[PDB]
Design a protein around this ligand. Structure first.
Ligand SMILES: N#Cc1cccnc1N1CC[C@H]2OC(N)=N[C@@]2(c2ccc(F)cc2F)C1
Length: 374
């Protein structure tokens, strides 16, 4: 899938984007790859933080759906107008799709100063599309209209101005040069978000010993459009307590653990070995099995002297496996078989003593009971 390798770029903390073209003649736009939402939405009018935007009037193939869409979330919102147009991904498959597009005409706290992207590609399912599930998402259109197999995979690599990060979005298959070792799969629990089930969490090999329902309260999702590992309140608190203890040899301000303040060390002296590894055990395809993905401090301390923000934060909407978990790994969104695969990434972080890992099986009792009953 050689022409698709290295087709993602971004700035640390501001997401990964892919170049796309919209309309005829093609308008080039950078689009954030977001497995946590399901709309294809593009800035369509001027904005302080947008260096270009989609101009429907310049496109001979635009069709207006005469329908508005409002997408409030927090910390923000966007609104716009629905239509269809022809869409292609230059460093993607060699196809062109007529896709729904939300042309964003007003927004608050959505576009990001300096991020270099002008729209979002929601890769999750129709159930969470706005205004409702009848607005076919981009990937659904791509699969229906072209032969492309119903699967994509993401290799996010990450790590003055914020550091540039890179990676690859492989549409339609699995590129075996982007990973090493075995691919382990966890089931997609429900096709809305990419919802999965975490059955155990360890911090430096010590079980947090919570009821596993706590890890998925109210859901756990894999989300390339969120930077941090976000954990439900009780789990977050348990985790930081444990990380504090392992690293207690040093002391950092409260704002660092709140992910607000940076912590800096003389360049090159970053004391990685005082921070523990974190293992998340995901439910396997076999009911009583799991496998673990182990992440290093190189993933959960985000570069911003060498300066870092702690990139684990509290959630009130369940666990979010964001970019800093995904950067460990090659992640396969196997929609056709309703499962998500993980393997150690050719661009994983590691030092001479430790490395990200994907290991299994571990046998674990009653993990169907680790979910939330809708
Ligand atoms: N839109 C939308 C949307 C539609 C449906 C569900 N969730 C959405 N969110 C959730 C909050 C963020 O988390 C994710 N994954 N994407 C969001 C996002 C992305 C980029 C950015 F700059 C700002 C953002 F808030 C938008």
């Amino acid at each position: 899938f050689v022409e698709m390798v290295d087709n993602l770029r971004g700035k640390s903390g501001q997401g990964y984007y892919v170049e796309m073209t919209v309309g005829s003649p093609p308008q080039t736009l950078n689009i954030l790859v977001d497995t946590g939402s399901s709309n294809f939405a593009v800035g369509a009018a001027p904005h302080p933080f947008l260096h270009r935007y989609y101009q429907r009037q310049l496109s001979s193939t635009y069709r207006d759906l005469r329908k508005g869409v409002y997408v409030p979330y927090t910390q923000g919102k966007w609104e716009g107008e629905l239509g269809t147009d022809l869409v292609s991904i230059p460093h993607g498959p060699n196809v062109t799709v007529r896709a729904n597009i939300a042309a964003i005409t007003e927004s608050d706290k959505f576009f990001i100063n300096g991020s270099n992207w002008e729209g979002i590609l929601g890769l999750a399912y129709a159930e969470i599309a706005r205004p409702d599930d009848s607005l076919e998402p981009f990937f659904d259109s791509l699969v229906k209209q072209t032969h492309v197999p119903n699967l994509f995979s993401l290799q996010l690599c990450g790590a003055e101005v914020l550091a540039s990060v890179g990676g690859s979005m492989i549409i339609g298959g699995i590129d075996h040069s982007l990973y090493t070792g075995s691919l382990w799969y966890t089931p997609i629990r429900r096709e809305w978000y990419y919802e999965v089930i975490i059955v155990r969490v360890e911090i430096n090999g010590q079980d947090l010993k919570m009821d596993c329902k706590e890890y998925n309260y109210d859901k756990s999702i894999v989300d390339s459009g969120t930077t941090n590992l976000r954990l439900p309140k009780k789990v977050f608190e348990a985790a930081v307590k444990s990380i504090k203890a392992a690293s207690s040899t040093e002391k950092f301000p409260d704002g660092f653990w709140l992910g607000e303040q940076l912590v800096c060390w003389q360049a090159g002296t970053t004391p990685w070995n005082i921070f523990p590894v974190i293992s998340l055990y995901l439910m396997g395809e076999v009911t009583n099995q799991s496998f673990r993905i182990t992440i290093l401090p190189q993933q959960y301390l985000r570069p911003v002297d060498d300066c870092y923000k702690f990139a684990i934060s509290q959630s009130s909407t369940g666990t979010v496996m964001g970019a800093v978990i995904m950067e460990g790994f090659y992640v396969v969104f196997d929609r056709a078989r309703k499962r998500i695969g993980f393997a150690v990434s050719a661009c994983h972080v590691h030092d001479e003593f430790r490395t990200a890992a994907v290991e299994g099986p571990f046998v674990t009792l009653d993990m169907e009971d680790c979910g939330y009953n809708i």
